Amino acid sequence: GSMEIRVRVEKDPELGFSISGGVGGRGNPFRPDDDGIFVTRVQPEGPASKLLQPGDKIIQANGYSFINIEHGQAVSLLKTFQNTVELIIVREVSS
Amino acid sequence: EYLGLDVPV
Questions:
Q1: From the CA of B5, how many Å to the nearest CA of chain A?
Q2: I need a surface site. Which of A1, A62, A87, A94 has the fewest CB within 10 A?
Q3: Do A18 and B9 touch (CB under 8 A)?
Q4: Which residues touch A41 (CB under 8 Å, ≥6 apart)?
Q5: Is A26 within 8 Å of chain B by CB?
Q6: With an 8 Å Cβ cutoff, is A61 touching chain B?
Q7: First vs last Cα of chain A: how many Å apart?
Q8: Is A46 an interface residue toward B (CB < 8 Å)?
Q9: A82: helix, coil or strand?
């Protein structure tokens, strides 16, 4: 099933996770036919540890929609934010 | 196809 979750990540000065995807992007390893932005890796001692996991789909960040966002715009937005970023993610959950 | 290139932020 899926779960929508609000996550606060404090930049120090990075978020400590990697992403793939976006409109115009080269995809992702989770939902390959989906244009979304997905968390691909979370630094184990970084600011997102215990909060984000690979597979999490970013659908909003600091109130900006990440639904069907272009890849470069998504990257640049996440990099432009300062201090805390409030994410909305969609996480798949085991049956 | 996706080939594993992700972007750290």
A1: 7
A2: A94
A3: yes
A4: A17, A18, A54, B6, B8
A5: yes
A6: no
A7: 7
A8: no
A9: coil
Length of chain B as a residue count: 9
The CATH code belonging to domain A1-95 is 2.30.42.10
**SS3 label, residue A77:** helix
Q: Would you state the torsion angle of the CA atoms of residues A22, B8, A3, A60, taken in this order, to the nearest 10 degrees?
A: -60
Residue A36 token pair? 């979304």
Contacts of B9 in chain A (CB under 8 A): 14-15, 17-19, 75, 78-79
Chain B residues near residue A18 by CB distance under 8 angstroms: 6-9
Answer whether A42 touches B (CB < 8 Å): no
Query: Distance between CA A20 and CA A75 in Å, rounded?
Result: 9
Method: X-ray
Q: Enter the resolution in angstroms.
A: 1.2
> DSSP letter at A25?
S
Give the up-direction half-sphere exposure of residue B4: CA atoms within 13 A in the CB hemisphere.
Answer: 0
